[PDB]
Amino acid sequence: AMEPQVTLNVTFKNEIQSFLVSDPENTTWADIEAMVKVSFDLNTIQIKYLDEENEEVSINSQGEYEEALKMAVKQGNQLQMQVHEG
Known part of the structure; x- marks a missing residue:
């Protein structure tokens, strides 16, 4: 146990x-996507994050989300994310 709060x-x-997400292991990518959609009034979105190689990589699944969170743990418990419409 267990990933700390991630921003x-x-x-x-x-x-x-x-978004301060208190218990990221207890979250789904669907939930995060939904939060971003509601916040920015978007329907179809692609979300990318900045990885260790300092490249934008899309998160398209629960697994890709979980991997992004493993990185966030190593990087001060935060992720820098960018949303694109469509």
């Missing part, structure tokens, strides 16, 4: 919102 810093265009 998701999510950019859409020139807006950014930070």
